[PDB]
């Protein structure tokens, strides 16, 4: 009731709730893929690092990759 925001509605229901479909999330839950299915993430935008998303060079991302195509000697 506090700290709510949009995008907390999982994908099983985000269809039924925007009127795109007529399948309640209790019906699309038999269609979510078991092998690669992932739970929702609430869009942690700004709520601290390691919750926010980071590219692979941001220097905040653990494991900042180097893009230099040439492999130095």
């Amino acid at each position: 009731k506090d700290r709510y925001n949009a995008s907390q509605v999982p994908a099983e229901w985000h269809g039924w709730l925007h009127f795109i479909t007529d399948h309640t999330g209790d019906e699309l839950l038999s269609l979510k893929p078991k092998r690669y299915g992932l739970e929702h993430k609430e869009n942690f935008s700004g709520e601290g690092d390691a919750y926010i998303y980071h590219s692979k060079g941001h220097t905040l991302n653990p494991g900042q990759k180097n893009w230099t195509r040439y492999q130095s000697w």
Binding site: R35, Y36, K56, N61, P62
Partner: protein
Amino acid sequence: GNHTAKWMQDRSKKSPMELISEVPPIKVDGRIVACEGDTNPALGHPIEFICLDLNEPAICKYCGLRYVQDH
């Protein structure tokens, strides 16, 4: 893997390469298979006809699924 270590930094969810190398190869009858995709020929990849003359499983390039002759 190493290729999959370039785009995935999670390293806790199984790498797609393993997710496809752990699915068993699909037995079939003839010498050519379809592998239209998942099940629906319109929600899968362009149909890729695979040859099963060899003994080892012949992977479908688009989906990674593997087919064997099953004689």
